[PDB]
């Protein structure tokens, strides 16, 4: 029947725990579609993936596909308005984004479930009648240039492009996909090229329905979703475009047995080993590449990493297959490098081949395959319910690789044991097919080449035949042994029955001087999982820079010590996070509840009886020093946020103070520190998931008893549970702190308009206002003015206080950026006064939906509760309470709020600005003074420049702390 539908796939295989309904189908024009019905979803979404990417960019216009990606949001014939799409989503609690890879351009969005069609309609036009407006083209080009500019000094991006430039230059893999102003404007201009026309041609030539896949999720029934998609996408024209293929590998003979010495931006030491391999995508039912990745990349006893670490040459290792494109892939083994390791690269590589030889000697093991198969099946069956936006975008992409019926299970459920494929891939991991890259500052001044797109400095050399020979003659090393059965594999998945006293929110079930225990048995996800969060309070974790360094080192040494044992648990879906905080320590264990008690007990026991390995201590200390210094290489806006944090927080040690006190941390000092840190503590925990009250109480008490027995831990005094306050800015005051980024040639800025302490009314005044200015800020400061790629506005919450913040990274100086933000504020005032009552009520409804969006998985609901606990506000019913108050606000309330707290002449304006200057910028005024289609910046007063952070805080009062919400139990 239905001529618009070529076929409706059979039952879509899903997890028996997945209540969502699915329907696969292929439209007449060839678009693969997957419909998902979820009658309970608060937000609906859709995504469309075009199987064409930067690899198909015309040789003379690098980055065109990426540019087309940006341009499609800027207007269509049906919806001409430059921001009709984004504005519509914003006003309906939605969001959107997109990315471009070598063979894909993925577009996606989410929106209130009641406005799926309105959003899908505007979205579908992207692939039917884009405008590619000339004015939008000249402006948006700056956004692309700005995006590339931020990656320029990024080591990951530089290495990513260096690999492409080190392969066959004739191969499309060598293309620069990001593109910039030069390649998208300048170059084409001085070549008589009309980018507008090129975009029209590219889109017309590659945006064919036969190469498109779509996924839509909404509350509507599968039949309604079907008619919806047919009605909006069946008109996409099918030009039967051939799927681009790349059978010849970018790395040919002359590209093998090559060594590269690279100079990084940050002070890092890394060794990258790469092997060219065939495209293994078609073997998804067996995944021979992952099999080898699992073995070679194993941490755990007898692994390559274990020996490499014991020898003090490496700290971390990553192994396995890496995607390339249809026709080719790579197999890598990347490792971290210690100072000693840097001097033994040849030996490290020999060990890599010795381990590989071991795998050849033992041959493929079915029990290993069986183990991964079982774990993958368990993972799929109990997979957490995903957020719509990410789910649709992911499905749209994978619809291009798997049959409709298998789209959900394809990446999880293994079916075939293939020793023939495993051996085939292992046969490619040989010395004569290797590429080795070393990244180190020690190569500074020893390089003779430069990568054009990023300016990366490196040197290329052929690996001497004897070195290759020695690796080829790699023999068995007794230190290398295959892993043993994973004893952490879960077997008990029974869901405990909901207890009679089960509560809607966490309940305080223990309130002692030693610990405060919040508990909630899962009442909606019903998966065999649990989240155990613990907050250990101790004044000695942040008393001074030295102790902060020791707190960090201690936990870092601890995790490094448990790694081998904890890796098996990680594979079995049982992980943990352990880190030092400004108040002590934070520990979180999550995953299948079955064996959590075992891992937890092990962690605490290890914590209270830790014996530091001197060698591990020195190496980890050296890496930490490096990590502190490397912050200088972070982006300008990250620096701005960093400085503001230091400025507004009562107590905060800087990275300079920390590394300065780091040379004072000795093994003896660290050994004395640990017992001191654990001597007195207070624990506030949240146990949430598939667990009973008695199990929770049991877990909590087990942690205390372990500390008491081995560390003789005593309760902390209530008066010692200190919380830091935020600096209280004076009415009508304006302070400016200026610094310079010596790595990035871009400026960064953060403007903070402090309002008042957090509370129901104050919270919603700020949030409603941010909701109203959110899309306009982006549209004005970026799409129109093109100040930069990174343009952000939103609420800032810290230490119980809150306000409005703006974050921008640009080529333009901070004082100019600030003038534009002030001009934008004026625009928003007029805009609010000029908006209709209904438009206002629309923003209220949008914020409401955003705040009431229900978490889809346990960790997300747990995080929300944890947020209430960590902030010590414990307002578990916050969303309902705050939204009810929100729906009470009028335009007048928001106008008054603005005039009293935000306006340039506001009686209670509390403003602080952080100016981060670009590398090649000696100074910059802190304030500055046509009309161009640019609005008028209000005139600003003279700011008080901050010369010393300490003095700044001393001369200002401190806000009080927010009073807790009262939660009564025992």
């Amino acid at each position: 029947n239905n001529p618009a539908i070529k076929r409706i796939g059979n039952h879509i295989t899903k997890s028996p725990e997945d209540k969502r309904e699915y329907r696969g189908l292929e439209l007449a024009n060839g678009i693969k579609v997957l419909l998902i019905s979820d009658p309970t979803t608060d937000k609906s979404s859709a995504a469309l993936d075009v199987h064409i990417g930067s690899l198909s960019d015309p040789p003379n216009i690098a980055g065109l596909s990426h540019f087309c990606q940006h341009m499609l949001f800027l207007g269509t014939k049906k919806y001409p308005k430059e921001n009709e799409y984004s504005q519509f989503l914003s006003e309906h609690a939605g969001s959107s984004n997109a990315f471009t890879s070598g063979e894909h351009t993925n577009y996606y969005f989410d929106v209130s479930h009641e406005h799926l069609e309105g959003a899908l309609d505007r979205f579908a036009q992207f692939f039917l009648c884009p405008l590619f407006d000339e004015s939008c083209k000249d402006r948006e080009v700056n956004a692309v240039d700005s995006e590339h500019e931020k990656n320029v000094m990024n080591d990951a991006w530089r290495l990513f492009q260096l690999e492409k430039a080190t392969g066959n230059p004739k191969h499309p893999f060598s293309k620069f996909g990001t593109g910039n102003k030069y390649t998208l404007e300048t170059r084409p201009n001085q070549e008589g090229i009309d980018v507008r026309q090129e975009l029209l041609k590219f889109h017309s030539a590659y945006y064919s329905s036969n190469l498109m896949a779509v996924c839509v999720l909404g509350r509507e029934s599968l039949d309604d979703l079907t008619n919806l998609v047919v009605k909006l996408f069946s008109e996409v024209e099918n030009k039967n475009v051939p799927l681009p293929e790349f059978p010849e590998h970018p790395f040919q003979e002359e590209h093998l047995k090559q060594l590269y010495k690279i100079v990084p931006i940050k002070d890092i030491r890394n060794l990258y080993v790469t092997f060219p391999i065939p495209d293994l995508q078609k073997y998804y039912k067996s995944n021979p590449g992952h099999y080898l990745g699992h073995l070679i990349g194993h941490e755990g006893p007898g692994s390559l990493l274990s020996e490499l670490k014991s020898k003090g040459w490496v700290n971390t290792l990553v192994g396995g297959q890496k995607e390339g494109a249809r026709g080719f892939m790579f197999f890598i083994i990347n490792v971290d490098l210690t100072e000693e390791g840097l001097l033994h690269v040849e030996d490290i590589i020999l060990h890599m081949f010795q381990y590989i030889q071991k795998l050849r000697a033992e041959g493929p093991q079915e029990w290993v395959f069986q183990e991964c198969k079982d774990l993958n099946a368990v993972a799929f069956r109990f997979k957490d319910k995903e957020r719509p936006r990410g789910y649709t975008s992911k499905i749209a992409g994978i619809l291009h690789y798997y049959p409709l019926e298998e789209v959900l299970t394809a990446e999880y459920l293994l079916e075939e044991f293939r020793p023939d494929l495993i051996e085939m891939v292992l046969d490619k991991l040989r010395p004569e097919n290797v590429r080795v890259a070393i990244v180190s500052k020690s190569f500074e001044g020893k390089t003779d080449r430069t990568e054009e797109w990023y300016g990366t400095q490196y040197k290329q050399e052929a690996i001497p035949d004897e070195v290759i020979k020695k690796w080829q003659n790699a023999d068995l090393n007794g230190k290398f042994k295959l892993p043993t059965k994973n004893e952490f594999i879960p077997t008990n998945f029974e869901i405990l029955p909901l207890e009679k006293e089960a509560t809607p929110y966490p309940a305080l079930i223990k309130d002692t001087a030693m610990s405060k225990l919040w508990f909630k048995q899962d009442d909606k996800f019903f998966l065999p999982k649990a989240c155990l969060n613990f907050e250990f309070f101790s004044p000695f974790a942040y008393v001074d820079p030295l102790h902060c360094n020791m707190a960090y080192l201690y936990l870092e040494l601890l995790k490094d010590s448990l790694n081998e044992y904890a890796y098996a648990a990680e594979l079995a879906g049982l992980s943990y996070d352990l880190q030092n905080t400004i108040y002590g320590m934070y520990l979180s264990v999550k995953g299948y509840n079955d064996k959590q008690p075992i891992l937890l007990k092990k962690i605490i026991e290890k914590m209270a009886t830790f014996e530091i390995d001197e060698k591990r201590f020195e190496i980890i200390k050296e890496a930490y020093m490096r990590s502190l210094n490397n912050f200088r290489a972070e982006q300008p806006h990250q620096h701005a946020m960093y400085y503001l944090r230091l400025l507004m927080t009562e107590v905060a040690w800087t990275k300079d103070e920390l590394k300065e006190a780091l040379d004072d941390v000795t093994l003896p000092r660290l050994k004395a520190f640990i017992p001191q840190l654990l001597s007195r503590l207070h624990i506030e925990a949240l146990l949430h998931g598939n667990i009973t009250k008695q199990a929770a109480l049991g877990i909590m008490q087990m942690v205390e008893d372990t500390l008491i027995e081995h560390a003789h831990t005593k309760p902390l005094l209530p008066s010692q549970l200190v919380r830091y306050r935020e600096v209280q800015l004076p009415d009508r005051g304006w302070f400016v702190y200026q610094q310079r980024n010596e790595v990035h040639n871009n400026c960064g800025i953060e403007i903070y308009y402090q309002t008042d302490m957090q509370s129901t009314s104050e919270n919603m005044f700020l949030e409603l206002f941010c909701q109203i200015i959110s899309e306009p800020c982006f549209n004005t400061l970026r799409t129109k003015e093109q100040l930069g790629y990174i343009v952000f506005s939103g609420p800032r919450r810290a230490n119980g206080i809150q306000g409005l913040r703006f974050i921008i990274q640009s080529e333009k100086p901070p004082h100019y950026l600030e003038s534009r933000v002030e001009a934008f504020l004026i625009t928003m005032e007029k805009s609010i006064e000029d908006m209709t009552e209904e438009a206002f009520q629309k923003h209220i409804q949008a914020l409401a939906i955003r705040r009431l969006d229900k978490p889809k998985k346990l960790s997300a609901e747990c995080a929300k509760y944890w947020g209430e606990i960590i902030s010590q506000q414990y307002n578990f019913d916050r969303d309902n309470t705050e939204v009810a108050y929100l729906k009470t606000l009028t335009k007048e309330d928001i106008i008054k709020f603005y005039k009293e707290m935000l306006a340039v002449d506001a009686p209670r304006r509390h403003k602080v600005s952080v100016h981060v200057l670009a590398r090649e910028m000696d100074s910059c005024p802190v304030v500055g003074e046509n009309d161009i289609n640019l609005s008028q910046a209000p005139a600003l007063p003279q700011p008080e420049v901050i010369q010393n952070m300490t003095e700044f805080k001393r001369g200002l009062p401190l806000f009080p702390l927010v009073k807790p919400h009262i939660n009564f139990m025992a």
Partner: peptide, 13 residues
């Protein structure tokens, strides 16, 4: 560990 864990974006998250 195993490598399962590079593209361009319209907008920063």
């Amino acid at each position: 560990f195993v490598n399962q864990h590079e593209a361009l974006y319209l907008v920063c998250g």
